[PDB]
Design a protein around this ligand. Structure first.
Ligand SMILES: O[C@H]1CCCC[C@@H]1N1CCC(c2ccccc2)CC1
Length: 382
């Protein structure tokens, strides 16, 4: 019961955090208006994650997994409270940077706590799949409705309501966990010297590239090619939520009957992502584009659900069984992808065209797929 209650509290926090990172992208240009200046503002949450994760990683290994989560929740609450009262450039920049710092402190600690509370292989992937589903829901389904709510009630009251909800969740966590009631880990620099973790980091940073490079430069192409309407341009990623949860469930089911092929699922996911990315530019209608975007989210779910518990298993079987400096590496990879994306995607599209960036991303994803054969012999380690 205690494990189930704490998991729900952690999952709710991840749903609200990912919803806040997306609902502000369309709002910001209204209060600002030179296109380079706007790009740096958006790519500021991910930049601070690269500079803070190497420092907040080992800190989690030293003070368990409750205090960092509380600090992260407090920072995110403060960040939300300054967006409601923000109508300038510097204020929005500061709010986005605070969002990045809070994410860096609060995502790694939550994932590490989920990994630590479930030390058994059959029920670890099952617990991580729920968190992945919550993250995908918050990132995909909610911002469409937030955009509709903004045009009707403004941005002051909804952000205050979200901040109040986050504070209530933080208070619930503080009451349940009771952090104030009655080993030395492997250094992060030396952890990356393990050949079995560098390949996983490379796989994550390669798989997170299509979303980061396609989010800021897809609506313009859709408008210029299909003459899409506002509803078509807005409700594009919403029907992609069902394939993600289906893929997560399928991976969880398959990892319990054959508990040694955790590399095959990752390779298949990478190949599916590459094929979908290569197919995306060859769509001239709304439904084929929706299907091709559904395939990408289906592949991402497979890759994540296959490669997330593998890091915990490797740390258990080859290093000191402590987490927090290991998921910092995954956060660093995701952050570097999402920080490189929204500054150069538009320039690449302008200089080379939309039909070639997608081909390059698909080619990279396809080429990295056979690299995962190096994890073939894992599971025999003692
Ligand atoms: O890959 C994971 C690695 C770091 C932790 C979280 C990362 N991941 C980011 C994409 C997210 C997602 C969001 C929207 C649609 C599909 C998938 C799933 C989670």
């Amino acid at each position: 019961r205690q494990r189930r209650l704490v998991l729900v509290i952690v999952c709710v926090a991840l749903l609200l955090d990912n919803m806040l990172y997306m609902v502000i992208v369309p709002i910001v240009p209204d209060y600002i208006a030179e296109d380079v200046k706007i790009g740096v503002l958006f790519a500021s949450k991910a930049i601070l994650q690269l500079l803070v994760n190497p420092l907040s990683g080992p800190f989690i290994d030293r003070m368990s997994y409750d205090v960092p989560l509380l600090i992260g929740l407090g920072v995110m609450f403060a960040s939300t409270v300054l967006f409601a009262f923000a109508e300038d450039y510097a204020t929005l920049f500061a709010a986005r940077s605070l969002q990045g710092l809070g994410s860096a402190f609060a995502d790694t600690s939550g994932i590490a706590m989920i990994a630590d509370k479930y030390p058994e292989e059959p029920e670890r992937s099952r617990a991580l799949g729920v968190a992945l589903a919550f993250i995908s829901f918050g990132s995909l389904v909610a911002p469409p409705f937030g955009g509709i709510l903004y045009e009707f009630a403004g941005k002051r009251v909804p952000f205050l309501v979200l901040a109040a909800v986050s504070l209530f969740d933080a208070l619930l966590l503080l009451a349940v966990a009771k952090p104030f009631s009655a080993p030395v880990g492997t250094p992060i620099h030396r952890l990356m010297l393990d050949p079995y973790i560098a390949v996983v980091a490379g796989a994550l940073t390669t798989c997170n590239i299509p979303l980061a490079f396609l989010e800021p430069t897809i609506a313009t192409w859709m408008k210029h090619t299909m003459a899409a309407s506002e509803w078509e341009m807005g409700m594009a990623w919403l029907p992609a939520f069902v394939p993600h949860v289906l893929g997560v469930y399928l991976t969880v089911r398959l990892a319990a009957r054959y508990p040694h092929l955790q590399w095959l699922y990752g390779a298949l996911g990478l190949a599916v992502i590459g094929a979908s990315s290569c197919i995306v530019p060859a769509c001239r209608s709304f439904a084929p584009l929706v299907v091709s975007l559904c395939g990408l989210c289906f592949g991402i779910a497979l890759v994540d659900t296959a490669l997330l518990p593998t890091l915990a298993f490797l740390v258990d079987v080859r290093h000191v069984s402590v987490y927090g400096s290991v998921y910092a590496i995954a956060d660093i990879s995701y952050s570097v992808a999402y920080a490189l994306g929204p500054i150069v995607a538009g320039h690449i599209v302008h200089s080379l065209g939309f039909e070639q960036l997608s081909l390059g991303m698909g080619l990279a994803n396809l080429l990295y797929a056979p690299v995962l054969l190096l994890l073939r012999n894992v599971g025999l380690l003692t």
